[PDB]
Design an enzyme around this catalytic site. Structure first.
Site, mmCIF file in Angstrom:
data_model
loop_
_atom_site.group_PDB
_atom_site.id
_atom_site.type_symbol
_atom_site.label_atom_id
_atom_site.label_comp_id
_atom_site.label_asym_id
_atom_site.label_seq_id
_atom_site.Cartn_x
_atom_site.Cartn_y
_atom_site.Cartn_z
ATOM 1 N N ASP A 118 -33.061 -10.429 -50.906
ATOM 2 C CA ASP A 118 -32.593 -9.246 -50.180
ATOM 3 C C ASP A 118 -33.584 -8.105 -50.264
ATOM 4 O O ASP A 118 -33.213 -6.963 -50.610
ATOM 5 C CB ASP A 118 -31.209 -8.860 -50.762
ATOM 6 C CG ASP A 118 -30.127 -9.764 -50.253
ATOM 7 O OD1 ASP A 118 -30.276 -10.383 -49.205
ATOM 8 O OD2 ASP A 118 -29.090 -9.888 -50.945
ATOM 9 N N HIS A 130 -17.725 -3.179 -46.279
ATOM 10 C CA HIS A 130 -16.760 -4.234 -46.577
ATOM 11 C C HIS A 130 -15.470 -3.467 -46.967
ATOM 12 O O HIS A 130 -15.633 -2.456 -47.712
ATOM 13 C CB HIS A 130 -16.912 -5.127 -47.842
ATOM 14 C CG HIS A 130 -18.015 -6.106 -47.718
ATOM 15 N ND1 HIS A 130 -19.301 -5.841 -48.157
ATOM 16 C CD2 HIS A 130 -18.047 -7.351 -47.228
ATOM 17 C CE1 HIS A 130 -20.083 -6.868 -47.918
ATOM 18 N NE2 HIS A 130 -19.331 -7.786 -47.355
ATOM 19 N N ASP A 167 -15.610 -2.119 -50.615
ATOM 20 C CA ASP A 167 -16.786 -1.322 -50.877
ATOM 21 C C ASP A 167 -16.242 0.153 -50.984
ATOM 22 O O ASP A 167 -16.649 0.923 -51.854
ATOM 23 C CB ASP A 167 -17.862 -1.302 -49.812
ATOM 24 C CG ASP A 167 -18.718 -2.515 -49.620
ATOM 25 O OD1 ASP A 167 -18.776 -3.237 -50.627
ATOM 26 O OD2 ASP A 167 -19.271 -2.765 -48.528
ATOM 27 N N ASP A 220 -31.364 -15.750 -52.801
ATOM 28 C CA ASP A 220 -31.530 -14.695 -51.761
ATOM 29 C C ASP A 220 -31.945 -13.399 -52.506
ATOM 30 O O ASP A 220 -31.290 -12.897 -53.425
ATOM 31 C CB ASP A 220 -30.393 -14.512 -50.809
ATOM 32 C CG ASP A 220 -29.030 -14.527 -51.457
ATOM 33 O OD1 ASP A 220 -28.753 -15.328 -52.413
ATOM 34 O OD2 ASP A 220 -28.299 -13.670 -50.872
ATOM 35 N N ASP A 256 -29.584 -5.447 -44.325
ATOM 36 C CA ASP A 256 -28.702 -5.974 -45.402
ATOM 37 C C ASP A 256 -29.658 -6.460 -46.495
ATOM 38 O O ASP A 256 -30.063 -7.620 -46.456
ATOM 39 C CB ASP A 256 -27.689 -6.980 -44.865
ATOM 40 C CG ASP A 256 -26.782 -7.616 -45.904
ATOM 41 O OD1 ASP A 256 -26.810 -7.208 -47.090
ATOM 42 O OD2 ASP A 256 -25.992 -8.556 -45.629
ATOM 43 N N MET A 276 -19.948 -1.674 -37.327
ATOM 44 C CA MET A 276 -19.454 -2.952 -37.851
ATOM 45 C C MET A 276 -18.718 -2.720 -39.144
ATOM 46 O O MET A 276 -18.992 -1.823 -39.939
ATOM 47 C CB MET A 276 -20.664 -3.874 -37.940
ATOM 48 C CG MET A 276 -20.503 -5.268 -38.379
ATOM 49 S SD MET A 276 -20.270 -5.378 -40.161
ATOM 50 C CE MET A 276 -21.939 -5.312 -40.797
ATOM 51 N N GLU A 319 -21.533 -15.335 -39.729
ATOM 52 C CA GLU A 319 -22.746 -15.327 -40.483
ATOM 53 C C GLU A 319 -22.938 -16.482 -41.465
ATOM 54 O O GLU A 319 -22.329 -16.675 -42.517
ATOM 55 C CB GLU A 319 -22.916 -14.000 -41.194
ATOM 56 C CG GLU A 319 -24.135 -13.829 -42.075
ATOM 57 C CD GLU A 319 -24.315 -12.531 -42.752
ATOM 58 O OE1 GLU A 319 -23.604 -11.534 -42.649
ATOM 59 O OE2 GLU A 319 -25.303 -12.517 -43.495
ATOM 60 N N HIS A 346 -31.441 -15.608 -45.011
ATOM 61 C CA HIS A 346 -30.569 -16.787 -44.980
ATOM 62 C C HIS A 346 -31.247 -17.960 -44.299
ATOM 63 O O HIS A 346 -31.346 -19.034 -44.954
ATOM 64 C CB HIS A 346 -29.295 -16.368 -44.265
ATOM 65 C CG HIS A 346 -28.449 -15.422 -45.025
ATOM 66 N ND1 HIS A 346 -27.130 -15.201 -44.554
ATOM 67 C CD2 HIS A 346 -28.584 -14.694 -46.134
ATOM 68 C CE1 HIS A 346 -26.523 -14.386 -45.382
ATOM 69 N NE2 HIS A 346 -27.388 -14.058 -46.316
ATOM 70 N N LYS A 359 -25.270 -19.004 -43.914
ATOM 71 C CA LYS A 359 -25.981 -19.038 -45.207
ATOM 72 C C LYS A 359 -25.834 -20.477 -45.732
ATOM 73 O O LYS A 359 -24.740 -21.055 -45.673
ATOM 74 C CB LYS A 359 -25.467 -17.988 -46.197
ATOM 75 C CG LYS A 359 -26.384 -17.704 -47.370
ATOM 76 C CD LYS A 359 -25.841 -16.668 -48.310
ATOM 77 C CE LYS A 359 -26.844 -16.236 -49.362
ATOM 78 N NZ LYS A 359 -26.171 -15.324 -50.341
ATOM 79 N N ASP A 419 -28.831 -9.069 -39.119
ATOM 80 C CA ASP A 419 -29.034 -8.539 -40.479
ATOM 81 C C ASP A 419 -30.532 -8.801 -40.825
ATOM 82 O O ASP A 419 -30.940 -9.974 -40.889
ATOM 83 C CB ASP A 419 -28.132 -9.066 -41.561
ATOM 84 C CG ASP A 419 -26.692 -8.720 -41.536
ATOM 85 O OD1 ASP A 419 -26.227 -7.903 -40.711
ATOM 86 O OD2 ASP A 419 -25.923 -9.311 -42.371
ATOM 87 N N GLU A 422 -29.074 -13.793 -40.469
ATOM 88 C CA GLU A 422 -29.756 -12.937 -41.430
ATOM 89 C C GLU A 422 -31.072 -13.595 -41.767
ATOM 90 O O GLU A 422 -31.174 -14.794 -41.994
ATOM 91 C CB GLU A 422 -28.956 -12.610 -42.675
ATOM 92 C CG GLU A 422 -29.678 -11.702 -43.688
ATOM 93 C CD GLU A 422 -28.771 -11.292 -44.827
ATOM 94 O OE1 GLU A 422 -27.689 -10.754 -44.464
ATOM 95 O OE2 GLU A 422 -29.246 -11.549 -45.972
HETATM 96 O O1 LIG Z 1 -25.395 -13.141 -48.665
HETATM 97 C C1 LIG Z 1 -24.492 -12.020 -48.568
HETATM 98 C C2 LIG Z 1 -24.211 -11.603 -47.139
HETATM 99 O O2 LIG Z 1 -25.514 -11.314 -46.596
HETATM 100 C C3 LIG Z 1 -23.240 -10.403 -46.989
HETATM 101 O O3 LIG Z 1 -23.777 -9.120 -47.355
HETATM 102 C C4 LIG Z 1 -22.613 -10.354 -45.611
HETATM 103 O O4 LIG Z 1 -23.492 -9.807 -44.581
HETATM 104 C C5 LIG Z 1 -21.312 -9.586 -45.450
HETATM 105 O O5 LIG Z 1 -20.342 -10.048 -46.332
HETATM 106 MN MN LIG Z 2 -25.811 -10.307 -44.344
#
Ligand SMILES: OC[C@@H](O)[C@H](O)[C@@H](O)CO
Ligand SMILES: [Mn+2]
Ligand SMILES: OC[C@@H](O)[C@H](O)[C@@H](O)CO
Ligand SMILES: OC[C@@H](O)[C@H](O)[C@@H](O)CO
Ligand SMILES: OC[C@@H](O)[C@H](O)[C@@H](O)CO
Ligand SMILES: [Mn+2]
Ligand SMILES: [Mn+2]
Ligand SMILES: [Mn+2]
Lengths: 393, 393, 393, 393
Positions: free
Chosen positions: D255, D52, D55, D253, D291, D86, D179, D218, D181, D243, D215
C-alpha cells in the site's frame, strides 16, 4: 547521452546475435556475423565485446577452422579497438549437458565439461580477458530426488577449484566469477542467488580469485532487491563483474534492455555503481556489461536500436543520480532520516559488551516510548529520489 | 504416529499462543497462559518449548514481576519435564523498533536493542538453551535510499559479533542462529535467504559459533527450493536449528502446519533430516521446531489439533521416507539415474588439471553425441517417490 | 490402477512428441512418428489423441504430402480405435506470428491467421472432434505502449466470433474452448486467467458455443488456486475442456506430469472432477487431457514412463479422493465446519431486503461476539484430507 | 504541479488514518480525528473523502454517539466543501467476520453481514455518494476442503443482488463496485482478479448497476499488468471506480504511494486514464482514489507528506504522458509499429468467413515468410516512452 569507450560498456556476442528462438518458436532473424558484430558495436561506442566459446567457434569445428575464425576475429578487434574483457564457456546447449556440466550425474560428462573449461581458460588468457565467467545453467534438477545435494556441491567445488588452481599454476591474470540464477532452464538451479553464490565461494580452496557476476533479472526472478544483493557482494568485495538488463516480475527471464524492467530499481543500481555508499566504502570499478536479448518482434534496426538504448538508459540514469546526490535538499533529507547516523558505530571507542550492558541510559533508564516518536521521513526521502528520476528537480 | 519426547519436537510459546490479529483484524482468541501452554504441550508429547523474552515477560514488567513470572514458569517446566532448547528476543513489535534493532538509523535505538539482546543471552544461559535465535524482522527498508547498504551490514556485524564475544567471554554453552526472511514486515529484509545469511556469517569475527535457523515458508516466499537451501546450510555445517511450517506460494507468510503447504517438498525435507545424503555426509541432529500459527477461524480445540497435526505430519512423512529409501526398486532406480555416480570424484586420485586436459579420451576423443543418449530416468525416479508418499508402494 | 478407455485420458501429439529444445538448448530426442504415437498411447490405455495442425501437417506440406500424412494417421486411428476429441491451431511457431495471429498489429497477418483457423475447423470436423481449442500464445506484448488495448480485444472478438459463426453456418458439433495463460512467450498475454477468459466470452456475439480450456500450470504461474478457478468455470457452465499437468511455482511453464507439481492442489482438483460440489451442482464430463512435456533429461523409455505416470497419478488421486468423501469422520468434520450450511440460502423464502433490515434478530440485537465464538475447525478438516491423500487412512 | 478539486483526488479516511499496526507490531501513530482528516485533506487539494462505516462509527457506538460523530463529520464537510463520492462497509475486522461476511459458512453471520450492508447503503445515500464499494477480504479460505465452491459463489450472488435490488427499490443513484484481491487476509480470496470480478458480474440478476473497483497493488500481487486489466474493465464498460497505490512485487500488499512501486506501469496507467485508447474508445471519468498507507516509520509530518506525494506523483506522470502523445516522433513510431493498424477490422465490409477462406491472397498464396520480415520496432517505441517519463525529452 553519447557513450564513449571510457564508459566501459561491454556487450556479449550472444545478445545482439540472439536470433529469436524461444520455447514456442523459431528464429525471426538471420545469424549475425561476428565480424559485423565487432564493427557495429565499435561504431556505437562500446568498449569491449565478450563471448561464449561456441558463440565464435562451433562445437565441432576442426582445428583449421578454429584458427581461420580466430584470425578474422582478432583482425576485427585490431581494426576497431574493442578489447575482450570477459570470456565464458557454453556448458548448456549441446544435448550432452542435459543434466549439467560440472554436476552432471554421469562422471564422463563431468570430465568433458571440466576439460572444455580448462581449454577455454587458455583462450581467455590469449584474448586478454581479466574475467572468466561461469554460469551453471544446467546444474540443478526438476525433481528433489534426482540428486544427492551434498555431492552436487562437492562436484561444483571440484570443478571451480580445479579451474582456479589451473589459473594460479599458469600464472594467468584472470579471476573467476560465478553467476547465480534461480531457475530456467532447470526447475531449480544450484547457487540460486547472490547469497548462495557468495556462501559457496567461502568453502573453496582457491576462494581468493573467485567472485560473483550477478544479473539484474536473475535476482528479480526470486523477488529480491537487486541493489541489496550487489551491495552485499560489494561489501564482501566479491563483485568482480556485472550483467545489466530488465525484468518485469517473477516469470521467465525476459532479458529486456536495462531500464525497461523495474525503473526505480535501475536508478538505485546506477547510484550504487557510480556514487557508491553515502558514508564511504567500496566502489565497483569494472565494466558495465549488458546481458540482454533484443525482442523477437523487431528486425536488425531494432537490434542496433536496442544496443544504443542500453547505453542511453545507463547515461540518463547516471546523470539523474549525480544530480540527486549533489542536491542540498537531498543531503538535508538524508541527514534527517539518519543515513549518515547509521555510519557511526553503536559502541563507543573502547566500550565492551559488559560496559554497554551496565550503562543505565542505554537500557534500564532508556525512554523507548520517546525514542519511538522520531519521524524518519523515509516517504519524503523517497519522493525526492523519484522527482530527481522524473527530471522534475 | 504418537510423538514422544525422544522425537525432539519443540514448539514456540507464540505459535499456539498466537491470538489472531492479522493486518485486517483483531484477535479471535483469548490470551494463552504460559503455564497452561507448558502443561498442554507436555501432555501432547513435545520435548521442549521456546520463547521470545516478551512472550513471557512483558516489556514494562518490573523486576518483582519478572521473578514472579519466571518462578511459576520454572515450576511448570519442573512439573512436566519440558526443556527450553532455544530462546530469542523480540526486536520487532514495540514502536521503537520501527526501523530495526541492530540496523536502526538511530544510534540510541541500536544500543537499546543490543542491550536487550545481551541481557536475554543471560536468561538463555539460565534456562539451559543451547541455541539463541536472532530474526532481524525489522532490519531493511521499503525504499532503496533509506539506508546506506554497506553501513547496514557493518551495524548488523557489530551487534552479532558483540553478542558472540559476550557468549565466549561468559563461557556460555550457546550458539547464535540467524534467521533469514525475504520480506514482511519490511518491504525488503537484509539477509533475505539462506545463502545471504550463510555468506554474511563468513565476514564475522566470531563466525565459529554463528549458524543459521532457516524457515520453510521464508525460503518459499522467494520461490526457492527449501531442501536445496537446507542441503547447502548442512553441507557448510551451519544448520544449527530449523523452523518447520507450511506456505502455499509467493504471498504473505502464512505459517500453516508443516505439511499443509508444499507437500512433496515437506516429504523431501523430512528425508534430508532423517536419512541425510544418499552417498553419506552430514546429518542434522538438533530439534525439530515448529514455527507456525493456528488459523484464526478456529477455537482452542483447533489450537491443540493444529499442534498435534505438526507432529503427526512429520511422523507420517518420516515413515514414508524410510520406506522409500529402504525399497530395493528405489535403490535400483537411484543407481540408474546416477545418484551414487555423483559421489565419485571427477578427477582420478592424483590427476592434475594438466593431466585431464591432455587426456584425449576425456576431451578430444570424447563422443559427446553418444554420452548425450543416456536416459537419466528422473521422471520414473520421481514417480516412485510420489507413490511412496501416497502410501501406494 | 490401470487405465482404460472409460477413463477418457487424452494426450496431445506435441506432449510425448516434445523433443527437448528449450531457450538454452537443442532437442535431446529424435522426432516421434505420429503413427507410432497413436499405437504406443493405445497400448498405454489412452482414450484419444489430440494435435495442432502443424504437429501433423508441416506448414509448407504439399497437397500430396498432406494426403499421405492424413492417410497414415487415419489408418492408425482405425487400427487402434483411438478417438480425436480436440484439435487446435498453431498460431505461434512461424516467425509470421511474432506479434500474434488474431491480434497482430499487421492486418494481413490477422487475415492469414483467421484463414488458417477456418481451414482447421473443417479438418477438426472431418476428424470427429467435439472441441476446438484456441490458445493465443503470441497475443500480448513485452512493452506497455506496443498495443491499443481496446482495439486488441475487438480484434480478438472479431476472430473468435467469425470462427463461431462459421461453425454455426456449417452445422458442425464443435464448441470453442479458450485457453488463458498470463505470460510466456509474451511478457504479458491477453486474457491471462480463467477470470479474464470468462469475462471476454460474455462480450461475444456467439458466446453460447464459446467456453474455457484452463490449464493447471497456467493458473499457478500467476499464483492462483486452480481448483477455485475451475470451480468458477463450472459454476458459469463454461468448463468445456481441461489441460492437466504440474507446476512447481511462479516461474517459466514447466509442463510436468499431473501430480508432479502441487500435490494437495492436484488431490483437490481430482476431488472436484470426480466428486463434484459437496451440496450438488454441475459436474465436468469431458476428456481428462494431459498437456505436459517429458523432461529433456529422459530418453524414449522416459517418454512412455511419463505418459503412464500421468494416468497413474490421476488414478491414485481418484482412489484417495473417493475414500475421503466416503469416510464418515470426514462427513462429520464437514458438517461441523459448516460446508453444508453454506448451501442454505441466506434469506428466508420470500424474505426481502426491507424484511431483513428490520428483522431485529438478524441485526439490531444480533450477538456478534457470541457468534464469533464458533470453532470452524478448518485445520482438523484439512488434516483429515491430507491423511486420506497419504493413505494413512 | 499543484492539485485542485478539478483533479478529483479522493482519499480514504483509513489511508492517512492508518495507525501502523501490522502482523509483527503495534500502532506507531495516535488515532486521527475525522474532523482533522477532512480539514487537512481540503488544505492539500483533495476533492473528496471516503470511508468504511466503522472508520467513522464504532461497531458498538450508541445512537447518541453515532449522531454526534455524524454531526461533527457533516460540519467538517460543510466547512471545507469536501464531497463524499464513495462509502464502503467493513466486513473484515470484527472476529464475527473470520470466515467472511457474505460467504461465511455460518448463515446467521451471513444474515448479519447483509443487514450491515443494507443499513450502510442508506448512510451512503444520505452522504451523497455515487459509488458503493464491496471488497470481500474474508471471503475465501486457507484450505481447499473448507468450502463448497459452487455454493460460495451463489452466496456471494445472493448478497450482491439483494443489495442491488434494494438500491433499485429505494431510487438511490448508487452503483456497486466490486473489488478483487488474490490473497491477504485469506490464503485464497474469492474473485481474485479483474477477470474474475467481471465474469461473476455477468451471472448477476442486477449486473447493470454492478461494476469494478480494481486496485493497483492487488493485480500486481498475482503479477498481472494492471494497465491491461483496467483496459479490459473499460472495454466492457465496467470501470466504475479505481484505487491507486504502489506495490514492489509479489508479496504482502504494501500500500505504497501511487508511483512508489512499478513506475513505468504507473506512467502507462496514467496515460490510459488521461489519454484514453489510441484509436478511441471509452474513457474513465471518476475519482482518482488513493488507497495506500503512510509507512509506519514516519510521524504525522510524513502522513501529510505521503498524502501530498500521491497527488504530486499523479500530476508529474500526467504532464509526461500528455507530452509523450503530443510528440510527433512518438506518433511516427506508433504508426510504424502498427498501433493504428490494430484498429482496422480484419475482415472487409460485408466479407464473410466463407469469402475469407476462399480469398487466395489471404491464405492460399499468402507470402508468410515475406510478411514475417516486418520490423515492428517495439523496442524503439518503448525507449521513446521511457525518455518522456524521465523528462529527457
Ligand atoms: O486490501 C484492502 C482493500 O484495499 C480495502 O481498503 C478496500 O478498498 C475497502 O474495504
Ligand atoms: Mn482498495
Ligand atoms: O541466463 C543466462 C546467463 O545470463 C548467461 O548468458 C551467462 O551470463 C553467460 O553464460
Ligand atoms: O516470521 C517470524 C519468524 O519466523 C520469527 O517467529 C522468528 O523465528 C522468532 O523471532
Ligand atoms: O502454453 C502452451 C499451451 O499450453 C498449448 O499447448 C495449448 O494447449 C495449445 O496450443
Ligand atoms: Mn548473464
Ligand atoms: Mn521462524
Ligand atoms: Mn494447454
Amino acid at each position: 547521452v553519447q557513450p564513449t569507450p571510457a564508459d566501459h560498456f561491454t556487450f556479449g556476442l550472444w545478445t545482439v546475435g540472439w536470433t529469436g528462438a524461444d520455447p514456442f518458436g523459431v528464429a525471426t532473424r538471420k545469424n549475425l556475423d561476428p565480424v559485423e558484430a565487432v564493427h557495429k558495436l565499435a561504431e556505437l561506442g562500446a568498449y569491449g565485446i565478450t563471448f561464449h566459446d561456441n558463440d565464435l567457434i562451433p562445437f565441432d569445428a576442426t582445428e583449421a577452422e578454429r584458427e581461420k575464425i580466430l584470425g578474422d576475429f582478432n583482425q576485427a578487434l585490431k581494426d576497431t579497438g574493442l578489447k575482450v574483457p570477459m570470456v565464458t564457456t557454453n556448458l548448456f546447449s549441446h544435448p550432452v549437458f542435459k543434466d549439467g556440466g560440472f554436476t552432471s550425474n554421469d562422471r564422463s560428462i563431468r570430465r568433458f565439461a571440466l576439460a572444455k573449461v580448462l581449454h577455454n581458460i587458455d583462450l581467455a588468457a590469449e584474448m586478454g580477458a581479466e574475467t572468466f565467467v561461469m554460469w551453471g545453467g544446467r546444474e540443478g534438477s526438476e525433481y528433489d530426488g534426482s540428486k544427492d545435494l551434498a555431492a552436487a556441491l562437492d562436484r561444483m567445488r571440484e570443478g571451480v577449484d580445479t579451474a582456479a588452481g589451473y589459473i594460479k599454476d599458469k600464472g594467468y591474470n584472470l579471476r573467476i566469477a560465478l553467476e547465480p540464477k534461480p531457475n530456467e532452464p532447470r526447475g531449480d538451479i544450484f547457487l540460486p542467488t547472490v547469497g548462495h553464490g557468495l556462501a559457496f565461494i567461502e568453502q573453496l580452496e582457491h576462494g581468493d580469485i573467485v567472485g560473483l557476476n550477478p544479473e539484474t533479472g536473475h535476482e528479480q526472478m526470486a523477488g529480491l532487491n537487486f541493489t541489496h544483493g550487489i551491495a552485499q557482494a560489494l561489501w564482501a568485495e566479491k563483485l568482480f563483474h556485472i550483467d545489466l538488463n530488465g525484468q518485469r516480475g517473477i516469470k521467465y527471464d525476459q532479458d529486456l534492455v536495462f531500464g525497461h524492467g523495474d525503473l526505480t530499481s535501475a536508478f538505485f543500481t546506477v547510484d550504487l555503481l557510480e556514487n557508491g555508499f553515502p558514508n564511504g566504502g567500496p566502489k565497483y570499478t569494472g565494466p558495465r556489461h549488458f546481458d540482454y536479448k533484443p525482442s523477437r518482434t523487431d528486425g536488425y534496426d531494432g537490434v542496433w536500436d536496442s544496443a544504443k538504448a542500453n547505453m542511453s538508459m545507463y547515461l540518463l540514469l547516471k546523470e539523474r543520480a549525480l544530480a540527486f546526490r549533489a542536491d542540498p535538499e537531498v543531503q538535508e533529507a538524508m541527514k534527517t532520516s539518519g543515513v549518515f547516523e547509521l555510519g557511526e558505530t553503536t559502541l563507543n571507542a573502547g566500550e565492551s559488551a559488559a560496559d554497554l550492558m551496565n550503562d543505565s541510559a542505554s537500557f534500564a533508564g532508556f525512554d523507548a516510548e520517546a525514542a519511538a516518536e522520531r519521524n524518519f521521513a523515509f516517504i519524503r526521502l523517497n519522493q525526492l529520489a523519484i522527482e530527481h528520476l522524473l527530471g522534475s528537480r
